[PDB]
């Protein structure tokens, strides 16, 4: 995360780290939505242009972590993948449309003060909170800049949602309604963005109606990290919620 800041302990208990087993490597961010399910971006599991095509056994996830340069014993938990579920209409060839994936865990993780599920938006939360200007929170362990450079503690930054027109005109890349963009405009004073390593991580918002945290987005893509005139794009989680519920109910 570029231009972000250290996160407080227990500030994002649903944060999940997706690791390639060997060579050991932090691949993406992800979120806990239940004791057996983790949400993340599909391009993190399947993206041939980067010769990325993982199977359950190549991967692993760590939940409840705060600092990489330390092993928080009895705190952090590791979980193996039982099954990967990529959205059936996921488009990696064109614009990363429907960039969403679910990962069912071999064994249910134990909740605690540091491991806790985030909520998925209902129609009221999405209708009222998905407004241009409204800010959300993006968190991850990705690069600190588009150039160590890797944080030791979970980073956090708050970004405002942007008007569709500004997003659309901000890139030559055709965008769809399954994605929304966020980030400060050039000359707003503030900055911040997700960077390589934060992908798949959650973009959350706190409902002022029930004070619960809702994941509205999934870090998806961008052209560089924190560049003026450019914005980060996120998978519109609500629009794709029926698929999420389908997978979890049916399996």
């Amino acid at each position: 995360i570029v231009e972000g800041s250290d996160a407080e302990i227990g500030m994002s208990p649903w944060q999940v780290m997706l690791f390639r087993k060997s060579p050991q490597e932090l691949l993406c961010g992800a979120s806990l939505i239940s004791d057996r399910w983790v949400l993340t971006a599909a391009h993190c599991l399947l993206y041939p242009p980067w010769d990325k095509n993982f199977t359950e056994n190549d991967l692993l996830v760590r939940i409840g972590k705060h600092s990489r340069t330390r092993y928080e014993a009895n705190i952090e938990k590791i979980s193996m993948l039982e099954k990967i579920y990529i959205h059936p209409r996921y488009n990696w060839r064109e614009n990363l449309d429907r960039d969403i994936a679910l990962m069912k865990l071999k064994k249910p993780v134990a909740f605690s003060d540091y491991i806790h599920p985030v909520c998925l938006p209902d129609r009221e939360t999405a209708a009222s909170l998905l407004q241009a200007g409204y800010k959300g929170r993006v968190t991850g362990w990705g690069n600190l800049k588009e150039t160590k450079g890797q944080p030791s503690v979970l980073q956090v930054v708050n970004l405002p949602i942007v008007e569709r027109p500004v997003c659309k005109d901000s890139t030559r890349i055709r965008i769809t309604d399954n994605m929304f963009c966020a980030g400060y405009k050039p000359d707003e004073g503030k900055r911040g963005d997700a960077c390589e390593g934060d992908s798949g991580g959650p973009f959350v918002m706190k409902s002022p109606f029930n004070n619960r945290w809702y994941q509205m987005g999934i870090v998806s893509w961008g052209e560089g990290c924190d560049r003026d005139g450019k914005y980060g794009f996120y998978t519109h989680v609500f629009r794709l919620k029926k698929w999420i519920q389908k997978v979890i109910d049916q399996f």
Partner: peptide
């Protein structure tokens, strides 16, 4: 009623706020 999702054990559950949530609320 959604389970206990979205309520952090060390914040909402303890009537405590983190250092930046007000920034979201104010937007």
């Amino acid at each position: 009623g959604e389970a206990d999702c979205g309520l952090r054990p060390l914040f909402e559950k303890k009537s405590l706020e983190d250092k930046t949530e007000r920034e979201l609320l104010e937007s």
